[PDB]
CSV table of N, CA and C and ligand atoms in Angstrom, one decimal:
chain,number,residue,atom,x,y,z
A,1,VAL,N,92.2,138.7,95.6
A,1,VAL,CA,91.8,137.8,95.9
A,1,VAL,C,91.9,137.2,97.1
A,2,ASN,N,91.0,136.4,97.2
A,2,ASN,CA,91.2,136.0,99.2
A,2,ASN,C,90.1,134.7,99.1
A,3,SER,N,90.4,133.8,100.2
A,3,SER,CA,90.1,132.6,100.5
A,3,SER,C,88.5,132.4,100.9
A,4,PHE,N,87.8,133.4,100.8
A,4,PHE,CA,86.4,133.0,101.3
A,4,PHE,C,85.6,132.5,100.1
A,5,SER,N,84.9,131.5,100.4
A,5,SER,CA,84.2,130.4,99.4
A,5,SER,C,82.7,130.6,99.6
A,6,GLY,N,81.8,130.3,98.6
A,6,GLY,CA,80.2,130.4,98.7
A,6,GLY,C,79.8,131.3,98.8
A,7,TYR,N,80.1,132.6,98.6
A,7,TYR,CA,79.3,134.0,99.1
A,7,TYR,C,78.6,134.2,98.0
A,8,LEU,N,77.5,135.0,98.3
A,8,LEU,CA,77.0,135.9,97.7
A,8,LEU,C,77.3,137.1,97.8
A,9,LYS,N,77.3,138.0,96.6
A,9,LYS,CA,77.9,139.2,96.5
A,9,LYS,C,76.7,140.4,96.7
A,10,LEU,N,76.7,141.1,97.8
A,10,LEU,CA,75.7,141.6,97.8
A,10,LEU,C,75.9,143.5,97.3
A,11,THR,N,77.1,143.7,97.4
A,11,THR,CA,77.8,145.2,96.5
A,11,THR,C,78.8,145.0,96.2
A,12,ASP,N,79.7,146.0,96.1
A,12,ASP,CA,81.0,146.2,95.5
A,12,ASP,C,81.8,145.5,96.5
A,13,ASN,N,81.5,145.6,98.0
A,13,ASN,CA,82.3,145.4,99.3
A,13,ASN,C,81.6,144.5,100.3
A,14,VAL,N,80.6,144.2,100.0
A,14,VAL,CA,79.5,143.3,101.1
A,14,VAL,C,78.9,141.9,100.5
A,15,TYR,N,79.5,141.0,101.3
A,15,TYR,CA,79.7,139.4,100.6
A,15,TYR,C,78.7,138.7,102.1
A,16,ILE,N,77.9,138.0,101.6
A,16,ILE,CA,76.8,136.8,102.7
A,16,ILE,C,76.9,135.6,102.3
A,17,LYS,N,76.9,134.7,103.6
A,17,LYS,CA,76.7,133.5,103.4
A,17,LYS,C,75.6,133.0,104.5
A,18,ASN,N,75.4,131.8,104.1
A,18,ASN,CA,74.7,131.1,105.4
A,18,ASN,C,75.9,130.3,106.1
A,19,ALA,N,76.3,130.5,107.3
A,19,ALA,CA,77.3,130.0,108.0
A,19,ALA,C,77.7,130.3,109.6
A,20,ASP,N,77.7,128.9,109.5
A,20,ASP,CA,78.5,129.3,111.3
A,20,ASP,C,79.6,129.9,112.0
A,21,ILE,N,79.5,130.9,112.1
A,21,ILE,CA,81.1,131.7,111.9
A,21,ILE,C,82.1,131.4,112.4
A,22,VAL,N,81.6,130.5,113.6
A,22,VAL,CA,83.1,129.6,114.0
A,22,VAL,C,83.6,128.6,113.0
A,23,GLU,N,83.0,127.8,112.5
A,23,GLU,CA,83.1,126.9,111.5
A,23,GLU,C,84.0,127.8,110.5
A,24,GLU,N,83.2,128.8,110.0
A,24,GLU,CA,84.0,129.6,108.9
A,24,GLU,C,85.7,130.0,109.3
A,25,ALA,N,85.8,130.8,110.3
A,25,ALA,CA,86.7,131.1,111.3
A,25,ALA,C,88.0,130.1,111.0
A,26,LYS,N,87.1,129.0,111.4
A,26,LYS,CA,88.6,128.0,111.9
A,26,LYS,C,88.5,127.4,110.2
A,27,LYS,N,88.0,127.6,109.0
A,27,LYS,CA,88.7,127.4,107.7
A,27,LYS,C,89.3,128.4,107.3
A,28,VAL,N,88.7,129.5,107.6
A,28,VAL,CA,89.7,130.6,106.6
A,28,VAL,C,90.6,130.8,107.1
A,29,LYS,N,90.9,130.9,108.7
A,29,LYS,CA,91.7,131.8,109.0
A,29,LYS,C,91.9,133.0,109.1
A,30,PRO,N,90.5,133.9,109.1
A,30,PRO,CA,91.0,135.4,108.5
A,30,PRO,C,92.0,136.2,109.2
A,31,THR,N,92.2,137.2,108.7
A,31,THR,CA,92.8,138.6,109.7
A,31,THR,C,92.1,139.0,110.9
A,32,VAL,N,90.7,138.9,110.5
A,32,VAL,CA,90.3,139.5,111.4
A,32,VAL,C,88.6,138.9,111.5
A,33,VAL,N,88.4,138.7,112.6
A,33,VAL,CA,86.9,138.1,112.9
A,33,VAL,C,86.4,139.0,114.1
A,34,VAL,N,85.1,139.2,113.7
A,34,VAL,CA,84.3,140.1,114.5
A,34,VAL,C,83.9,139.6,115.5
A,35,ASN,N,83.9,139.9,116.9
A,35,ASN,CA,82.9,139.4,117.7
A,35,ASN,C,81.7,140.1,118.1
A,36,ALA,N,80.5,139.8,118.2
A,36,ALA,CA,79.6,140.5,118.6
A,36,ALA,C,79.2,140.5,120.0
A,37,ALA,N,80.5,141.5,120.5
A,37,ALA,CA,80.8,141.8,122.1
A,37,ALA,C,79.7,142.6,122.6
A,38,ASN,N,79.9,142.4,124.2
A,38,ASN,CA,79.2,143.4,125.4
A,38,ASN,C,80.3,144.3,125.8
A,39,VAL,N,80.2,145.4,126.5
A,39,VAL,CA,81.2,146.6,127.1
A,39,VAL,C,81.9,145.9,128.1
A,40,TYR,N,81.2,144.6,128.7
A,40,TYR,CA,82.2,143.8,129.5
A,40,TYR,C,83.0,142.9,129.3
A,41,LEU,N,82.8,142.5,128.0
A,41,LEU,CA,83.6,141.3,127.2
A,41,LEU,C,83.5,140.3,127.9
A,42,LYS,N,82.0,140.0,128.4
A,42,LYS,CA,81.8,138.9,128.8
A,42,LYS,C,81.0,138.0,127.6
A,43,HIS,N,81.6,137.1,127.1
A,43,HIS,CA,81.5,136.1,126.0
A,43,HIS,C,80.3,135.0,126.5
A,44,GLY,N,79.0,135.2,127.0
A,44,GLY,CA,78.1,134.5,127.4
A,44,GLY,C,77.6,133.6,126.1
A,45,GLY,N,76.9,134.2,125.4
A,45,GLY,CA,75.7,133.5,124.6
A,45,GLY,C,76.0,134.1,123.0
A,46,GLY,N,74.9,133.5,122.1
A,46,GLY,CA,75.2,134.3,120.6
A,46,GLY,C,76.3,134.1,120.1
A,47,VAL,N,77.0,134.6,119.0
A,47,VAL,CA,78.3,134.7,118.5
A,47,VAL,C,79.5,134.7,119.7
A,48,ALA,N,79.3,135.6,120.6
A,48,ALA,CA,80.3,135.7,121.3
A,48,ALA,C,80.7,134.7,122.3
A,49,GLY,N,79.6,133.8,122.8
A,49,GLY,CA,79.8,132.6,123.7
A,49,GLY,C,80.4,131.5,122.7
A,50,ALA,N,79.9,131.3,121.5
A,50,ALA,CA,80.3,130.4,120.4
A,50,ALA,C,81.9,130.7,120.2
A,51,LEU,N,82.2,132.0,120.1
A,51,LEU,CA,83.5,132.0,119.6
A,51,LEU,C,84.5,131.8,120.7
A,52,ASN,N,84.1,132.5,121.8
A,52,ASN,CA,84.9,132.0,123.3
A,52,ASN,C,85.2,130.4,123.7
A,53,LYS,N,83.7,129.7,123.5
A,53,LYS,CA,84.4,128.5,123.4
A,53,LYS,C,85.0,127.4,122.6
A,54,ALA,N,85.1,128.1,121.3
A,54,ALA,CA,85.9,127.7,120.4
A,54,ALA,C,87.5,127.7,121.0
A,55,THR,N,87.7,128.8,121.5
A,55,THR,CA,88.8,129.3,121.5
A,55,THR,C,89.2,128.8,123.2
A,56,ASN,N,88.3,127.6,124.1
A,56,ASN,CA,88.3,126.8,125.1
A,56,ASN,C,88.6,127.8,126.4
A,57,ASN,N,88.0,128.8,125.7
A,57,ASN,CA,87.8,130.1,126.9
A,57,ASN,C,89.2,131.1,127.2
A,58,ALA,N,89.8,131.1,126.2
A,58,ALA,CA,91.4,131.8,126.3
A,58,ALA,C,90.9,133.1,125.5
A,59,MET,N,89.7,133.2,125.0
A,59,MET,CA,89.1,134.8,124.9
A,59,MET,C,88.8,135.6,126.2
A,60,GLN,N,87.7,134.7,126.8
A,60,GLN,CA,87.5,135.4,128.1
A,60,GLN,C,88.5,135.6,128.7
A,61,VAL,N,89.5,134.9,129.2
A,61,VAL,CA,90.8,135.2,129.9
A,61,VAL,C,91.2,136.5,129.5
A,62,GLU,N,91.7,136.7,128.1
A,62,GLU,CA,92.0,137.7,128.1
A,62,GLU,C,91.3,138.6,127.6
A,63,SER,N,90.2,138.8,127.7
A,63,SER,CA,88.9,139.9,128.1
A,63,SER,C,89.3,140.3,129.1
A,64,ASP,N,89.0,139.4,130.3
A,64,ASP,CA,89.2,139.8,131.6
A,64,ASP,C,90.4,140.9,132.2
A,65,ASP,N,91.5,140.4,131.4
A,65,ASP,CA,92.9,140.9,131.8
A,65,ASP,C,93.0,142.6,131.4
A,66,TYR,N,92.0,142.4,130.0
A,66,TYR,CA,91.7,143.9,129.1
A,66,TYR,C,90.5,144.6,129.3
A,67,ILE,N,89.4,144.2,130.4
A,67,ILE,CA,88.9,145.0,131.2
A,67,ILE,C,89.3,145.2,132.2
A,68,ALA,N,90.1,144.6,133.4
A,68,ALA,CA,91.0,145.2,134.2
A,68,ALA,C,91.7,146.3,134.3
A,69,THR,N,92.3,146.1,132.8
A,69,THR,CA,93.3,147.4,132.8
A,69,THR,C,92.4,148.6,132.2
A,70,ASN,N,91.4,148.1,131.2
A,70,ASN,CA,90.9,149.4,130.8
A,70,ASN,C,89.8,150.1,130.9
A,71,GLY,N,88.8,149.0,131.8
A,71,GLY,CA,87.6,149.4,131.6
A,71,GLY,C,86.6,148.8,130.6
A,72,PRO,N,85.1,149.3,130.8
A,72,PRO,CA,84.6,148.9,129.6
A,72,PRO,C,84.5,149.3,128.7
A,73,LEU,N,84.1,148.8,127.2
A,73,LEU,CA,83.9,149.4,126.2
A,73,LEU,C,82.8,150.4,125.9
A,74,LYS,N,82.6,151.4,125.0
A,74,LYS,CA,81.3,152.2,125.2
A,74,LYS,C,80.4,150.9,124.2
A,75,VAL,N,79.2,151.6,124.2
A,75,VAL,CA,78.2,151.2,122.9
A,75,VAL,C,78.6,151.6,121.7
A,76,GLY,N,78.7,151.0,120.6
A,76,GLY,CA,79.2,151.6,119.4
A,76,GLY,C,80.9,151.1,119.5
A,77,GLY,N,81.5,151.1,120.6
A,77,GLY,CA,83.3,151.1,120.9
A,77,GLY,C,83.5,149.6,119.8
A,78,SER,N,85.0,149.4,120.0
A,78,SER,CA,85.7,148.0,119.9
A,78,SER,C,86.9,148.4,120.5
A,79,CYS,N,87.5,146.8,120.3
A,79,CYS,CA,88.9,146.9,120.5
A,79,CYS,C,89.3,145.8,119.9
A,80,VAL,N,90.6,145.7,119.7
A,80,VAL,CA,91.2,144.8,119.0
A,80,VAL,C,91.9,143.9,120.0
A,81,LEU,N,91.9,142.3,119.8
A,81,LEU,CA,92.2,141.2,120.6
A,81,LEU,C,92.7,140.3,120.0
A,82,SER,N,93.4,139.4,120.6
A,82,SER,CA,94.2,138.1,119.7
A,82,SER,C,92.8,137.7,119.2
A,83,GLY,N,93.0,136.6,117.8
A,83,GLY,CA,91.9,135.9,117.3
A,83,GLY,C,91.9,134.4,117.8
A,84,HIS,N,93.1,134.2,118.7
A,84,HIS,CA,93.4,132.9,119.3
A,84,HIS,C,93.4,131.7,118.2
A,85,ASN,N,92.9,130.8,118.0
A,85,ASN,CA,93.1,129.6,117.4
A,85,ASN,C,91.9,130.0,116.0
A,86,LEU,N,91.2,130.8,116.0
A,86,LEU,CA,90.2,131.2,114.9
A,86,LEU,C,90.8,132.2,113.8
A,87,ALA,N,91.6,133.5,113.9
A,87,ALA,CA,92.0,134.4,113.2
A,87,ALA,C,93.2,134.9,113.7
A,88,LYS,N,93.8,135.6,113.1
A,88,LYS,CA,94.8,136.6,113.5
A,88,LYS,C,94.5,137.6,115.1
A,89,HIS,N,93.5,138.2,114.5
A,89,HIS,CA,93.0,139.2,115.4
A,89,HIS,C,91.3,138.6,115.4
A,90,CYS,N,91.0,139.5,116.8
A,90,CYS,CA,89.2,139.7,116.4
A,90,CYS,C,89.0,140.7,117.2
A,91,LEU,N,88.3,141.8,116.5
A,91,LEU,CA,87.7,143.1,116.5
A,91,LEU,C,86.7,142.7,117.4
A,92,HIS,N,86.4,142.8,118.4
A,92,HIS,CA,85.1,143.2,119.5
A,92,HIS,C,84.4,144.2,119.1
A,93,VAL,N,83.5,144.1,118.6
A,93,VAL,CA,82.2,145.3,118.6
A,93,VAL,C,81.3,145.2,119.3
A,94,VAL,N,80.9,146.5,119.9
A,94,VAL,CA,79.8,146.5,120.9
A,94,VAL,C,78.7,147.3,119.9
A,95,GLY,N,77.7,146.1,119.3
A,95,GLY,CA,76.3,146.7,119.0
A,95,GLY,C,75.5,147.0,120.1
A,96,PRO,N,74.3,148.2,120.0
A,96,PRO,CA,73.3,148.5,120.9
A,96,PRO,C,72.8,146.7,121.0
A,97,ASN,N,72.0,146.8,122.2
A,97,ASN,CA,71.4,145.6,122.5
A,97,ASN,C,70.1,145.9,122.8
A,98,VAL,N,69.3,146.2,121.9
A,98,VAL,CA,67.8,146.4,122.0
A,98,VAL,C,67.2,145.8,123.3
A,99,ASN,N,67.6,144.7,123.9
A,99,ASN,CA,67.3,144.0,125.2
A,99,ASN,C,67.5,144.7,126.4
A,100,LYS,N,68.1,145.8,126.0
A,100,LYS,CA,68.6,146.5,127.2
A,100,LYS,C,68.2,148.0,126.9
A,101,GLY,N,67.6,148.4,126.0
A,101,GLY,CA,67.2,149.7,125.8
A,101,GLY,C,67.9,150.7,125.0
A,102,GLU,N,69.0,150.1,124.5
A,102,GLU,CA,70.3,151.2,123.8
A,102,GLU,C,69.8,151.4,122.6
A,103,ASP,N,70.3,152.9,122.1
A,103,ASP,CA,69.8,153.3,121.1
A,103,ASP,C,70.5,152.6,119.7
A,104,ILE,N,69.4,152.2,118.9
A,104,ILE,CA,69.5,151.8,117.5
A,104,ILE,C,70.4,152.4,116.6
A,105,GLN,N,70.4,153.9,116.9
A,105,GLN,CA,71.5,154.6,116.1
A,105,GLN,C,72.7,154.2,116.6
A,106,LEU,N,73.0,154.0,117.2
A,106,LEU,CA,74.5,153.5,117.9
A,106,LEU,C,74.8,152.4,116.9
A,107,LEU,N,74.2,151.5,116.1
A,107,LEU,CA,74.3,150.7,115.1
A,107,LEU,C,75.7,151.0,114.2
A,108,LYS,N,75.0,152.4,113.9
A,108,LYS,CA,75.9,152.8,112.3
A,108,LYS,C,77.4,153.1,113.0
A,109,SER,N,77.6,153.9,114.3
A,109,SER,CA,78.8,153.9,115.1
A,109,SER,C,79.4,152.4,115.3
A,110,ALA,N,78.7,151.5,115.5
A,110,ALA,CA,79.4,150.3,115.8
A,110,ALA,C,79.9,149.5,114.5
A,111,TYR,N,79.2,149.9,113.0
A,111,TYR,CA,79.8,149.4,112.0
A,111,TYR,C,81.2,150.2,111.5
A,112,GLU,N,81.1,151.1,112.0
A,112,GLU,CA,82.4,152.3,111.5
A,112,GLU,C,83.7,151.5,111.7
A,113,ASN,N,83.6,151.0,112.9
A,113,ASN,CA,85.0,150.2,113.5
A,113,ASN,C,85.6,149.4,112.5
A,114,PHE,N,84.5,148.6,111.6
A,114,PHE,CA,84.6,147.9,110.4
A,114,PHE,C,85.8,148.4,109.5
A,115,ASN,N,85.9,149.6,109.2
A,115,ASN,CA,86.4,150.6,108.0
A,115,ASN,C,87.7,150.8,108.7
A,116,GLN,N,88.3,150.3,109.7
A,116,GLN,CA,89.6,150.4,110.2
A,116,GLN,C,90.4,149.2,109.7
A,117,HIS,N,89.3,148.1,109.1
A,117,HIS,CA,90.0,146.8,109.2
A,117,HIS,C,89.7,146.5,107.6
A,118,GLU,N,90.9,146.1,106.6
A,118,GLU,CA,90.6,146.0,104.9
A,118,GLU,C,89.6,144.8,104.6
A,119,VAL,N,89.8,143.9,105.5
A,119,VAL,CA,88.8,142.6,104.9
A,119,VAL,C,88.4,142.1,106.4
A,120,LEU,N,87.1,141.6,107.1
A,120,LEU,CA,87.0,141.3,107.9
A,120,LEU,C,85.6,139.9,107.5
A,121,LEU,N,85.4,139.3,108.6
A,121,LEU,CA,84.6,138.0,108.3
A,121,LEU,C,84.0,138.6,110.0
A,122,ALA,N,82.4,138.6,109.6
A,122,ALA,CA,81.8,139.1,110.8
A,122,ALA,C,80.5,138.8,110.6
A,123,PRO,N,79.5,138.8,111.7
A,123,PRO,CA,78.3,138.8,112.1
A,123,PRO,C,77.2,139.7,111.9
A,124,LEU,N,76.2,139.8,111.7
A,124,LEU,CA,75.2,141.0,111.8
A,124,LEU,C,75.3,141.6,113.3
A,125,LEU,N,76.0,142.8,112.9
A,125,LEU,CA,75.6,143.5,114.2
A,125,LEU,C,74.5,143.7,114.8
A,126,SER,N,73.7,144.0,116.4
A,126,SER,CA,72.8,143.9,116.9
A,126,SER,C,71.6,143.0,116.7
A,127,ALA,N,72.0,141.3,115.7
A,127,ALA,CA,71.1,140.5,115.6
A,127,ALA,C,71.3,139.9,116.7
A,128,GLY,N,69.9,139.0,116.2
A,128,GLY,CA,70.1,137.4,117.4
A,128,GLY,C,69.8,138.3,118.6
A,129,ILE,N,70.4,137.6,119.5
A,129,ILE,CA,70.2,138.0,120.9
A,129,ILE,C,70.2,139.6,121.4
A,130,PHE,N,70.9,140.1,120.7
A,130,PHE,CA,70.6,141.6,120.5
A,130,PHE,C,69.6,142.2,120.1
A,131,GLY,N,68.8,141.7,119.7
A,131,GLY,CA,67.4,142.0,119.9
A,131,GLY,C,66.8,143.1,118.7
A,132,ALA,N,67.8,143.4,117.7
A,132,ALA,CA,67.3,144.5,116.5
A,132,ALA,C,67.0,143.3,115.6
A,133,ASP,N,66.4,144.2,114.3
A,133,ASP,CA,65.8,143.9,113.2
A,133,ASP,C,67.3,143.4,112.1
A,134,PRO,N,67.5,141.8,111.7
A,134,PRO,CA,68.5,141.8,111.1
A,134,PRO,C,68.4,142.5,109.9
A,135,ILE,N,67.2,142.8,109.2
A,135,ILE,CA,67.2,143.6,108.0
A,135,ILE,C,67.7,144.7,108.0
A,136,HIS,N,67.6,145.4,109.5
A,136,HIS,CA,68.1,146.7,109.2
A,136,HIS,C,69.5,146.5,109.7
A,137,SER,N,69.9,145.7,110.4
A,137,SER,CA,71.5,145.5,110.7
A,137,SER,C,72.3,145.2,109.5
A,138,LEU,N,71.9,144.8,108.5
A,138,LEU,CA,72.5,144.3,106.7
A,138,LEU,C,72.0,146.0,105.9
A,139,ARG,N,71.3,146.5,106.3
A,139,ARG,CA,71.1,147.6,105.2
A,139,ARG,C,72.3,148.9,106.0
A,140,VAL,N,72.0,148.4,107.3
A,140,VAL,CA,73.0,149.6,108.1
A,140,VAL,C,74.8,149.2,107.5
A,141,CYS,N,75.0,148.0,107.6
A,141,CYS,CA,76.1,147.6,106.9
A,141,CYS,C,76.5,148.0,106.0
A,142,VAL,N,75.9,147.7,104.6
A,142,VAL,CA,76.2,147.9,103.3
A,142,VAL,C,76.1,149.7,103.6
A,143,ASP,N,75.5,150.5,103.9
A,143,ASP,CA,75.7,151.7,104.0
A,143,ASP,C,76.6,152.5,105.1
A,144,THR,N,77.4,151.7,105.7
A,144,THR,CA,78.4,152.3,106.5
A,144,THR,C,79.7,151.8,106.1
A,145,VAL,N,80.1,150.4,106.0
A,145,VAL,CA,81.0,149.9,105.7
A,145,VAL,C,81.9,149.7,104.4
A,146,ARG,N,82.9,150.3,104.2
A,146,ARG,CA,83.7,150.6,102.8
A,146,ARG,C,84.6,149.5,102.7
A,147,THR,N,85.0,149.3,103.5
A,147,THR,CA,86.2,147.8,103.7
A,147,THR,C,85.2,146.8,103.4
A,148,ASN,N,86.2,145.6,102.8
A,148,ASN,CA,85.4,144.5,102.6
A,148,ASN,C,85.1,143.4,103.7
A,149,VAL,N,83.8,143.1,103.6
A,149,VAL,CA,83.1,142.5,104.8
A,149,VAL,C,82.5,141.1,104.0
A,150,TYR,N,82.8,139.8,104.9
A,150,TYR,CA,82.1,138.8,104.7
A,150,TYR,C,81.4,138.5,106.0
A,151,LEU,N,79.8,138.4,105.7
A,151,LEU,CA,78.9,138.2,106.5
A,151,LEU,C,78.4,136.8,106.9
A,152,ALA,N,78.6,136.2,107.9
A,152,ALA,CA,77.9,135.1,108.5
A,152,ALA,C,76.5,134.9,108.7
A,153,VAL,N,75.8,134.3,108.6
A,153,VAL,CA,74.3,134.2,108.7
A,153,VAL,C,74.2,133.1,109.4
A,154,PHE,N,74.0,132.4,110.8
A,154,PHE,CA,73.7,131.2,111.0
A,154,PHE,C,72.4,130.5,110.7
A,155,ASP,N,71.4,131.4,110.7
A,155,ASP,CA,70.2,130.8,110.9
A,155,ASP,C,69.9,130.6,109.0
A,156,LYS,N,69.6,129.7,108.7
A,156,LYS,CA,69.1,129.7,107.0
A,156,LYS,C,68.1,130.4,106.5
A,157,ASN,N,67.1,130.0,107.8
A,157,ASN,CA,65.8,131.1,107.4
A,157,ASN,C,66.1,132.5,107.1
A,158,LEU,N,66.9,132.8,108.2
A,158,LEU,CA,67.2,134.3,108.3
A,158,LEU,C,67.7,134.5,107.0
A,159,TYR,N,69.2,133.9,106.2
A,159,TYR,CA,70.0,134.2,105.4
A,159,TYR,C,68.8,134.2,104.3
A,160,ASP,N,67.9,133.4,104.2
A,160,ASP,CA,67.0,133.4,102.7
A,160,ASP,C,66.1,134.5,103.0
A,161,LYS,N,66.1,134.9,104.1
A,161,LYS,CA,65.0,136.1,104.2
A,161,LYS,C,65.6,137.4,104.0
A,162,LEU,N,67.0,137.3,104.2
A,162,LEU,CA,67.9,138.5,104.3
A,162,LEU,C,68.2,139.3,102.5
A,163,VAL,N,68.8,137.2,101.9
A,163,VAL,CA,69.0,137.6,100.2
A,163,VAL,C,67.6,138.1,99.8
A,164,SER,N,66.5,137.5,99.9
A,164,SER,CA,65.2,137.8,99.0
A,164,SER,C,64.8,139.2,99.5
A,165,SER,N,65.0,140.0,100.4
A,165,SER,CA,64.8,141.4,101.0
A,165,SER,C,65.3,142.3,100.8
A,166,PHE,N,66.8,141.6,100.5
A,166,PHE,CA,67.9,142.8,99.9
A,166,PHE,C,67.5,143.8,98.7
A,167,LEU,N,67.6,145.1,99.3
A,167,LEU,CA,67.3,146.1,98.3
A,167,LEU,C,68.8,146.2,97.4
B,201,LIG,O1,75.3,136.8,111.7
B,201,LIG,C1,74.8,136.4,113.4
B,201,LIG,C2,74.7,137.2,114.0
B,201,LIG,C3,73.5,137.2,114.6
B,201,LIG,C4,72.6,136.0,114.1
B,201,LIG,C5,73.9,135.4,113.6
B,201,LIG,N1,73.9,134.0,113.9
B,201,LIG,C6,75.2,133.5,113.9
B,201,LIG,N2,75.7,133.3,112.8
B,201,LIG,C7,76.7,132.4,112.4
B,201,LIG,N3,77.5,131.9,113.4
B,201,LIG,C8,76.9,132.0,114.7
B,201,LIG,N4,77.6,131.5,115.7
B,201,LIG,C9,76.5,131.8,116.5
B,201,LIG,C10,75.5,132.6,116.1
B,201,LIG,C11,75.8,132.6,114.9
B,202,CL,CL1,73.0,135.2,118.2
């Protein structure tokens, strides 16, 4: 039993809700919140900009030190950093950005990072301003993640579309 509330159950391990991931994180304080990161951990917009804003830019400060030490992530890769005031940990995961020409096949690799954590609050990778089809992202999530994932979908219209079209 966990404290996630109001989710629709899609499969044995995947749950979905129309919610602002920032407000959800502040309520649940999950062990792991997933960020929709880029390889530079430059948290400018979308989920990343919103999460970082909610940390008062502490996420960005921590991320800049991470990059200065380690260099950029790989597309499809991840790193674990602090969750600041939102969660114990933030798993920064880089899905391919279609608006940069990146290989959509890398979306499965991106979701594989979730399997290193027993429970996660997460967005749909590569959706939104990353330019992929969210229906496809949900399908890859369900077919790749085996741990317990609670998906927050900001856009109510998209949420309803994702539920109604889910196979
Ligand atoms: O699932 C994500 C992945 C792409 C579209 C969805 N959008 C959001 N859902 C919830 N909170 C959010 N805060 C900022 C953006 C956002
Ligand atoms: Cl977005």
